[PDB]
Structures are given as C-alpha cells and as structure tokens.
Design a protein around this nucleic acid. Structure first.
Ligand SMILES: [Mg+2]
Ligand SMILES: [Mg+2]
Ligand SMILES: [Mg+2]
Ligand SMILES: [Mg+2]
Ligand SMILES: [Mg+2]
Ligand SMILES: [Mg+2]
Ligand SMILES: [Mg+2]
Ligand SMILES: [Mg+2]
Ligand SMILES: [Mg+2]
Ligand SMILES: [Mg+2]
Ligand SMILES: [Mg+2]
Ligand SMILES: [Mg+2]
Ligand SMILES: [Mg+2]
Ligand SMILES: [Mg+2]
Ligand SMILES: [Mg+2]
Ligand SMILES: [Mg+2]
Ligand SMILES: [Mg+2]
Ligand SMILES: [Mg+2]
Ligand SMILES: [Mg+2]
Ligand SMILES: [Mg+2]
Ligand SMILES: [Mg+2]
Ligand SMILES: [Mg+2]
Ligand SMILES: [Mg+2]
Ligand SMILES: [Mg+2]
Ligand SMILES: [Mg+2]
Ligand SMILES: [Mg+2]
Ligand SMILES: [Mg+2]
Ligand SMILES: [Mg+2]
Ligand SMILES: [Mg+2]
Ligand SMILES: [Mg+2]
Ligand SMILES: [Mg+2]
Ligand SMILES: [Mg+2]
Ligand SMILES: [Mg+2]
Ligand SMILES: [Mg+2]
Ligand SMILES: [Mg+2]
Ligand SMILES: [Mg+2]
Ligand SMILES: [Mg+2]
Ligand SMILES: [Mg+2]
Ligand SMILES: [Mg+2]
Ligand SMILES: [Mg+2]
Ligand SMILES: [Mg+2]
Ligand SMILES: [Mg+2]
Ligand SMILES: [Zn+2]
Lengths: 116, 181, 23, 69, 83, 97
RNA sequence: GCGACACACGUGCUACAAUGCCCACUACAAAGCGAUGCCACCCGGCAACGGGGAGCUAAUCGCAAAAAGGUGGGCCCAGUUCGGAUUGGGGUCUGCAACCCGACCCCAUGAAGCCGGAAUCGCUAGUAAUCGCGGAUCAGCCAUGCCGCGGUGAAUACGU
RNA sequence: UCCUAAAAGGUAACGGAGGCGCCCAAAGGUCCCCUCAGGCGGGACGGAAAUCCGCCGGAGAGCGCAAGGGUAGAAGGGGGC
C-alpha cells in the first residue's frame, strides 16, 4: 500500500492509477502531477522513488483520504440521522434523499426487488 | 549476544525510570520482558490447500525463526474439524530475537497499519501481560506485496515479569508501545 | 456518455456549459 | 538453535521515506518502507495530515450577521 | 440553495417573536407557519411549533441544527411502511 | 404478474383475491398467461368485467355483464375459457390431408 | 398534498463499449425565436454565473456552438479512461419563498448493468438507423416529453 | 458389567439396567521425554466451543468400544530403535 494507504495499479498511467484512491478523481489527479512536476503519461511501474515520496507527501497532506474520508461522511450522515431532519429520515429507513421518485425505480437505494 | 537499540534503550533509559517511578528495592524486582509468542490461528488450511508453508515461510522471514505447528485437541462438527488436524502456527521468541522483532514492530510495523490510531490500552492480562492482533502480514517490512498470496493476520502475546497491569503498561509504554488512550 | 455531466458529450446533451464545455 | 531450518539474521538497514535509517537485524539486509514511527501522524505529536479542521460545524457558519435585530 | 448575494431568509414576522423572547427572557412556545424560514443561532434553545399541514410539531433547536430549515424537523407524511 | 383495475368503484383485497382465484380456471390449459389485466366497472344495468390476456398463441379479449358482480366475473371466465380453448386447438384441426 | 412506496404494467432516456470512450485543433445546415427581450465584446471566476457595455422595433443585430464528421494524440479488452446512478461537501440563478419539492456548476463517491425469459414493436428511399438545432407552455423548471428543422444515409421484398 | 446378594465366596424369578460375536501392524516390546478436564482474564478473521498467553485447578479429563474396578509417583500424550 504505497500511496496513500492503498496500492495503485502499476503498468497504468499515474493520472489514472491515482484515481483508484478513495478521494481522488480525475481533477485531483491532474492537480497532484503539476504540483510535483511528474509526467502524467508515465507508468506507475516506471516511477522514481524520489518522485514517489514527493507525490506521497503532497497527496497525503492536502486532502482527506481513505478511512478518514469514510468517517466524516458517516459522521455527517450520523448527525443528520440524530438531529431528525428530513434527509436523516431518508438515511434511517434507506429511501432516496434528493427529491427523487419512489413510486417506480429508486432501486439503488432499496436494492433488488422484493416480491409479495 | 548482539548489540541492539531496543535492548540498550531498556537497560539505559527504561530501567532507572521504572525504579524511580515505583521504588523497587531489588534489581530483579524491576519488570523485565520474558517472552513474545506469535500465533497464526489460521484454521483456514484445514482441508483445501493444507500446504500452509507460505505462512510458515512468512513467519520464518519476519521473526528469523521457524514456527511450529498446532493441531486440534478435539474434533469439532461445525468447524469441520477432525482431531489432530494442523490448524495453526506458533513461534516463541525470546532474548535477542525478541528484541529484534520488537524493534522492527515498534519502528515499522505498527506505523504501517491501515488507519492506525494506537494500541488498545485495555488489552492487558491483569497479571501484567499484553496481547494484540493483526489483520495482515504485509504490515511487517520483510513481507512485500508480490510474494504474498492471501491476507492472514496473527496474534502477539508479550509476557512480562511484572505483576500488575500498571507496571506492565509502564514498561511497555516506556519501551515505545503507542497506546491510543 | 451523453448522461455523464463531467464530459463534453454530456453537456451537449443537457445544453449547458462549464469547465468541460466552455464558451 | 536447529541448524538449517532458520533464515539467517544479518545486519539490516531499514530506510524510511522521511529519511529515517534504522540499524537492526533481519533476513533482508536492506528494506525500504513507506512510513516509520518517527514520521507517523499519531507518533509525531498531533501531526494531523490534512484535517486539523475544528469540525468546524455548526456555529462556524457566520455568513452572515446581517439579519435585523 | 439560496444565493450568498441574497441574505439568510427568515420570515421577519417569525424573527420578531424570536428577539422579543431573547430580551425579556426565553422561552414561550411559538406556533408558526414558517417552514421556509432558516434556523438562526438566536433561535437555539427555544421550542418552536412547526405546522405540517395538520399538526404543530414541537421542535427544540440545538447547536448542530442551525444551517437547516424548520420544515425539515416537522415532516408532512405519516408512513409506517407496508404489510 | 396479474393486474386488476376497479374503474369508478371501490373493491377490497378480498374481492381482488376472488378474481385471482377465478382466473385459476385458465391455468387448466397449462399455457402461459401474460399479464392478465382485469377491469371492473358499474353500468346502470349491472357490473361489467373486461379482460385482455396474451398467450403464446394469441390474445384473449372478452366481456361479462350481469346484475351480480361475481356473476359477471363468471361470464367473463366462461368467455375467456372458450377463446383459450380455441386458440390451443384450432391448429390441430387441419392435420390432414 | 397532487412529488407517498412492501409491489405490479405501459411509454421513454442513458447504457452495457474499440465500427468505441476522452482530450486538443478544424470544417458543412435548415427552420424558428428575440424591447423590464436576444445579448455581441471586455473583465472577475475552474465553473455555473456575476459586473461592465455596443447592436438589434430586427434577410441589418443577437440566440449561434451546429453535432455526427475531418486532423492529431491518448486509452489496449479490464465492470476498465465503458456506464454515470446513488450519496457527502461547496456555490450560482430564478423567485416573497427551492424543507417537503426547482434547474445548473464544482470537488469527492463511481452502483446496477458483459446485449437481456416467456412474449412483443417500428420501418419499403432520403424511409429505418444514427447526429445535432429551434419553438410552444414558460419567473424558474423536474422536457429523457410534444410539435417542427435539417446532417450522414442503409438492408430487404422469392411469394400470399 | 452393575444392582437384587442380607460388609468372605456363592445365591433364584418371564426381577431392575446395559453390552458382546469386534478391533489395533501399533492401539504391540523397550528406552527417553511430557501431564488433563474445567473456571477466570487477555488475543486478527474466530464464534459457547479451532489455535495463542497468563493465573487457578489431585483429577471431575484421558485410557478404541457396555458397565464396574483401577489409574497422572501412569495404565494417559509424544518420539526413538
Ligand atoms: Mg478515487
Ligand atoms: Mg540484570
Ligand atoms: Mg485490562
Ligand atoms: Mg505476568
Ligand atoms: Mg511490508
Ligand atoms: Mg452515441
Ligand atoms: Mg466516465
Ligand atoms: Mg548440534
Ligand atoms: Mg390489480
Ligand atoms: Mg377499488
Ligand atoms: Mg380507485
Ligand atoms: Mg370493451
Ligand atoms: Mg365452464
Ligand atoms: Mg403543494
Ligand atoms: Mg419525491
Ligand atoms: Mg400485485
Ligand atoms: Mg418487469
Ligand atoms: Mg422519457
Ligand atoms: Mg468486454
Ligand atoms: Mg467498480
Ligand atoms: Mg456484475
Ligand atoms: Mg469509469
Ligand atoms: Mg447497440
Ligand atoms: Mg420468442
Ligand atoms: Mg408503405
Ligand atoms: Mg430540444
Ligand atoms: Mg423560447
Ligand atoms: Mg423556460
Ligand atoms: Mg427531480
Ligand atoms: Mg453379589
Ligand atoms: Mg454385591
Ligand atoms: Mg458378596
Ligand atoms: Mg472360593
Ligand atoms: Mg510410533
Ligand atoms: Mg490400547
Ligand atoms: Mg485450559
Ligand atoms: Mg472477534
Ligand atoms: Mg474464542
Ligand atoms: Mg476418569
Ligand atoms: Mg508409547
Ligand atoms: Mg513406542
Ligand atoms: Mg538395530
Ligand atoms: Zn519516517
């Protein structure tokens, strides 16, 4: 688990393998490769260990990643379900939160269909 | 015996701090480290590929000591367990090897743990011994991501000559054990 | 692709502009 | 000990990413690691990597104090 | 959400009853039809009855529920499930 | 599955089951009934029961009218049975020459 | 409240990828709409947008960019640089007011889905398929709808 | 094998309860080494119960199999020849 607590896929480009980190999309990928001046097309299996610790230190010290990101999102839902707001109720029962239709579809929040 | 940073740190900085903090009358009365037994509970290699020599090889690389096998004292239905079936590993580390492994554990292993927030303070025996667990073996430096096939944690039991959990926690935290509370 | 908000093709489908489809 | 069954322990250099070198003994004389106890956030005081925020919710809004009173 | 260029919206007539209770001393129960009004820090501690089309649900305002609206805590649908 | 519709009327889940049990008579032929839709209503004369079912060998359309609600359901089943019994045997007629 | 959600049916949108996805550059339409309207152009911002401000009762000026396509570069068969659902946080605008219950922008999350059972729909030439644009209603918009417009442009008909 | 059986042995009933018609090539000989069940506490997946550590624990475990007797100062667990 080199960076940043997970292992990034080698033989892939660094701007791509960095997305395999819970908290880094294509945006924060092109960001960490300019702040360190590291060629985004170069493969992970071809990185310099000097370029590793530089990209490591910048990424791990700029955005919350991995378990620390999962804690606040869980805590943000935790307070939503504790205060008792309408969005908290949708998380407690498990229904959609963002004004979506529930008569049909809505299958991602409910899961596969339950026959009756 | 070999000259080690952790054993020297014990004899130099941990002994007098302990004697001062507790007021021991005799040199032997001070808490000392007795042994460190590591045990891979395994049991996943009952049937299937019972060839667990990859795990024993990993333990022999991490500790520098070849482990021994542990088998079942009885047959168990629900666990799919026949009596006398090899189900685990156990290596007993003492003296210089104990110091070496504890050095590498405190300086490299415990840091590299995913979402590490310290060692559980209430994990003490009551008699003055400590225990902990590990979810992976990639935590140790001698184990890389290539030579591994499956994730397998382990149990670590540190046995101390201390009599209370107080003196034991003193000795262990002084030696550098990071406690979350 | 036409449903992906973070792409050129996706904002043509929607009819809006942004960083991925400037004007 | 039993000869021929134990990997030999030899003087070992354990190099960390932050530049920390550790003189020890192991089966591989050189081992590089991503993190060590001298640079982990939980060890080095309270080096909260990115998030030393302060929650910051909820009274930390204060945008703004313009409603009449 | 509402624009930062515009202000934090309270129905004025509701904020009046808030400040009148902060001077002489909190608190007395307030009935309101202001689901649109945003909770303000000066509302923390009081007990506001929010109307949900039928009932006036008593809702105690705390420290963690300041950035929300009053209508989020007096829901409008009685739903116990199916079956 | 099976769908029932009460047009400008109000029926109970008990009555909805009776319609489901009367449609078991079509299961006799051991052929696939594809989304049998049932429509009930109230004329001035009496109740009316419609049904539009698809089978792998065609579709079934019928109508039953009677003063008694369940009796119109019966007539609908009688007329559905007949159509079903024809769609499963009309091919067997011209096997020779 | 008409926006409910143990479920069921119809119509659609977007997909399951290399005859493809993404980035940069560059060509070719028609029909409409536009005076607290359409906004050129400048500037702030990653952006939505905001602040300036010329023109146009409009074959004059504006919406406006057409998209597929063309050129170049990347991706290399993976639940992936396919797919963009769901959720966390931060903003913009309309509007008295976006909690229930608006659209949009941005960071993060990155699901089902590997071409679909029984059954069934459309289409005979500029047609199907695929690609984009405008308008009514309209403060805004849940429009993937409807009514129109063109771009590329097939297969097949022995026979009843 | 136990009870009935009346503290030596023996003792009947269509009296009360159970087992046998096998097995083991080590489950045999010998030398050397080791000590249980259980309870409490601690320990990744791991649980009432898998394996690990500590403390208490004379035998309640074990001894192929019914029952009784015997048994760790071994008849129990392991190895050598
Ligand atoms: Mg990521
Ligand atoms: Mg000494
Ligand atoms: Mg304790
Ligand atoms: Mg002790
Ligand atoms: Mg390692
Ligand atoms: Mg397409
Ligand atoms: Mg995508
Ligand atoms: Mg020797
Ligand atoms: Mg029905
Ligand atoms: Mg009804
Ligand atoms: Mg009705
Ligand atoms: Mg009819
Ligand atoms: Mg009949
Ligand atoms: Mg309403
Ligand atoms: Mg809704
Ligand atoms: Mg149903
Ligand atoms: Mg269906
Ligand atoms: Mg649609
Ligand atoms: Mg594929
Ligand atoms: Mg995935
Ligand atoms: Mg799948
Ligand atoms: Mg993807
Ligand atoms: Mg296709
Ligand atoms: Mg078919
Ligand atoms: Mg025709
Ligand atoms: Mg349109
Ligand atoms: Mg218009
Ligand atoms: Mg409009
Ligand atoms: Mg919506
Ligand atoms: Mg006797
Ligand atoms: Mg006797
Ligand atoms: Mg006798
Ligand atoms: Mg005798
Ligand atoms: Mg033997
Ligand atoms: Mg024997
Ligand atoms: Mg025990
Ligand atoms: Mg557990
Ligand atoms: Mg346990
Ligand atoms: Mg016994
Ligand atoms: Mg023996
Ligand atoms: Mg022997
Ligand atoms: Mg011999
Ligand atoms: Zn370090």
């Amino acid at each position: 688990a080199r960076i940043a607590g997970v292992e990034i896929p080698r033989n892939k480009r660094v701007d791509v393998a960095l997305t395999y980190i819970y908290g880094i999309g294509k945006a924060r990928a092109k960001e960490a490769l300019e702040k360190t001046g590291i060629n985004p097309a170069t493969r992970v299996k071809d990185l310099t260990e000097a370029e590793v610790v530089r990209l490591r230190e910048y990424v791990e010290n700029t955005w919350k990643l991995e378990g620390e990101l999962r804690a606040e999102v869980a805590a943000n839902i935790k307070r939503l379900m504790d205060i008792g707001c309408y969005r908290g109720l949708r998380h407690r029962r498990g229904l959609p939160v963002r004004g979506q239709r529930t008569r049909t579809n809505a299958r991602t929040r409910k899961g596969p269909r339950k026959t009756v | 015996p070999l000259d080690l940073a952790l054993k020297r740190k014990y004899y130099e900085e941990v002994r007098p701090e302990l004697i001062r903090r507790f007021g021991y009358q005799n040199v032997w009365e001070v808490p000392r480290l007795e042994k460190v037994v590591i045990n891979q509970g395994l049991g996943e290699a009952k049937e299937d590929a019972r060839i667990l020599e990859k795990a024993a090889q990993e333990l022999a690389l991490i500790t520098g000591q070849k482990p021994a096998v542990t088998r079942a004292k009885k047959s168990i239905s629900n666990f799919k367990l026949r009596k006398g079936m090899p189900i685990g590993l156990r290596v007993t580390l003492r003296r210089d090897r104990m110091w070496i492994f504890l050095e590498k554990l405190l300086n490299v292993a415990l840091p590299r743990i995913r979402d590490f927030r310290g060692l559980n303070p209430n994990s003490f025996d009551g008699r003055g011994n400590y225990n902990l667990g590990l979810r992976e073996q990639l935590i140790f430096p001698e184990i890389t991501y290539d030579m591994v096939d499956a994730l397998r944690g382990m149990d670590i039991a540190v046995v101390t000559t201390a009599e209370t959990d107080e003196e034991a926690r003193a000795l262990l935290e002084l030696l550098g054990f990071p406690f979350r509370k | 692709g036409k449903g992906d908000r973070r792409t050129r093709r996706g904002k043509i489908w929607r009819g809006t502009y942004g960083k991925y489809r400037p004007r | 000990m039993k000869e021929g069954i134990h990997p030999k322990l030899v003087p070992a250099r354990i190099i960390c990413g932050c530049g920390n070198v550790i003189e020890t003994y192991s089966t591989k004389p050189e081992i590089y690691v991503e993190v060590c106890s001298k640079c982990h956030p939980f060890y080095t005081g309270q080096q909260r990597f990115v998030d030393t925020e302060g929650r910051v919710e909820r009274f930390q809004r204060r945008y703004g104090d313009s409603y009449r009173k | 959400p509402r624009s930062l260029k515009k202000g934090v919206f309270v129905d004025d007539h509701l904020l009046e009853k808030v400040l009148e209770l902060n001077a002489k001393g909190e608190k007395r129960l307030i009935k309101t039809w202001s689901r649109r009004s945003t909770i303000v820090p000066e509302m923390v501690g009081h007990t506001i009855a929010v109307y949900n089309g039928k009932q006036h649900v008593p809702v105690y305002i705390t420290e963690n529920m300041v950035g929300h609206k009053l209508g989020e805590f007096a829901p409008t649908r009685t739903y116990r499930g199916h079956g | 599955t099976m769908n029932i519709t009460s047009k400008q009327m109000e029926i109970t889940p008990a009555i909805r089951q009776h319609v489901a049990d009367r449609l078991a008579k079509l299961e006799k032929w051991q052929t696939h009934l594809i989304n049998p839709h049932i429509i009930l209503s109230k004329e001035p004369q009496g109740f009316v029961a419609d049904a539009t079912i698809n089978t792998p060998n065609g579709v079934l359309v019928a109508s039953g009218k009677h003063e008694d609600m369940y009796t119109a359901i019966n007539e609908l089943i009688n007329k559905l049975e007949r159509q079903l019994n024809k769609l499963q045997h009309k091919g067997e007629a011209r096997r020779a020459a």
